[PDB]
Amino acid sequence: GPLGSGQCLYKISSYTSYPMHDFYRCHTCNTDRNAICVNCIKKCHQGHDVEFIRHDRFFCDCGAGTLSNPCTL
Amino acid sequence: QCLYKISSYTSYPMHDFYRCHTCNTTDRNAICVNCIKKCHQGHDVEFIRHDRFFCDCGAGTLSNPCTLA
Ligand SMILES: [Zn+2]
Ligand SMILES: [Zn+2]
Ligand SMILES: [Zn+2]
Ligand SMILES: [Zn+2]
Ligand SMILES: [Zn+2]
Ligand SMILES: [Zn+2]
Ligand SMILES: [Zn+2]
């Protein structure tokens, strides 16, 4: 298998999957964008207009090449 | 004071990034501090701080009170 595909945890995928977290935004309660935990979104905002959001602490749209201009770094 | 205290735990799980409203072809983008300075100089940028465990609902910041407290 490719390098980094073993089952020892000292491998790249352990580090790149680690700094992620998920939360919800409720657009029904609004306009300053809020952040809501999963338990509250399911119980406190049942039937509301909700949005799932996943954050990667180190992800950068600029360096990732998703913006109109290429990253200068 | 000793660092083994509640405030150490409550300050730890935070991270910050920038949104560039000038570069709006990617909606709700996330940009690092180095890129916002060198790649988006003069753009309409917004600093955003997030706490992994913060919840506006439980915090009482929304119109209705939280039902899970
Ligand atoms: Zn909550
Ligand atoms: Zn709501
Ligand atoms: Zn950049
Ligand atoms: Zn970047
Ligand atoms: Zn920009
Ligand atoms: Zn976050
Ligand atoms: Zn709640």
Scanning B23-52 for CB atoms below 8 A from A yields 23, 25-26, 29-32, 34-36, 38-40, 50, 52
Q: Where are the domains of chain A?
A: 1-73
Q: Which SS3 state, helix, strand or coil, does residue B59 take? A: helix
Rounded (10°) CA dihedral A40, B29, A13, A20: -20
Give the angle B13-B33-B47 at the CA atoms, nearest 5°: 70
Single out the residue of A69, A63, A24 nearest to residue A43, CA to CA. A24
List of E strands, A1-73: 20-26, 50-56
- Resolution reached, in Å? 2.2
Closest of B49, B52, B51, B47 to residue B19, by C-alpha: B47
Partners of B26 on chain A (C-beta within 8 Å) are 61, 66-67
Establish, for the pair of chains A and B, how many residue pairs have beta carbons separated by less than 8 Å.
Answer: 91
- List the structure tokens of B26: 């990617």
Please state the φ and ψ torsions of residue A47, each to the nearest 5 degrees. 80, 0
DSSP state, A2? Answer: -
What's the alpha-carbon Rg for chain A, to the nearest Å?
18
Residue A36 DSSP symbol: B
Closest CA to B30 of B20, B22, B40, B39: B20
B64: left (phi over 0), alpha (psi -120 to 50) or beta: beta
Distance CA B10, CA B39 (A): 32
Look up residue A44 and give its two tokens.
């406190």
What residues form DSSP beta bridges with A25? Answer: A51
Quote the CA–CA distance of A35 and B46 in Å, as a whole number.
17
Q: Which residue out of A25, A54, A60 would a mutagenesis test of the B interface target, given it has the greatest number of B Cβ atoms within 10 Å?
A: A60
Query: Considering only CB atoms, which chain B residues are within 8 Å of A34?
Result: 56-57, 61-62
B39: helix, strand or coil:
coil
The residues, any chain, with a CB within 8 Å of residue A57's CB and separated by 6 or more, are A19, A20, B15
Helices (H) and strands (E) in chain B, counts: 3, 2
Rounded to whole angstroms, how far apart are CA atoms B48 and B19? 7
Closest CA to B56 of A47, A20, A43, A41: A41
**Residue among B34, B69, B9 at smallest CA distance from A63:** B34
Tokens of A35: 């952040």
Going by their DSSP bridges, the two strands B14-20 and A50-56 should be labelled as unpaired
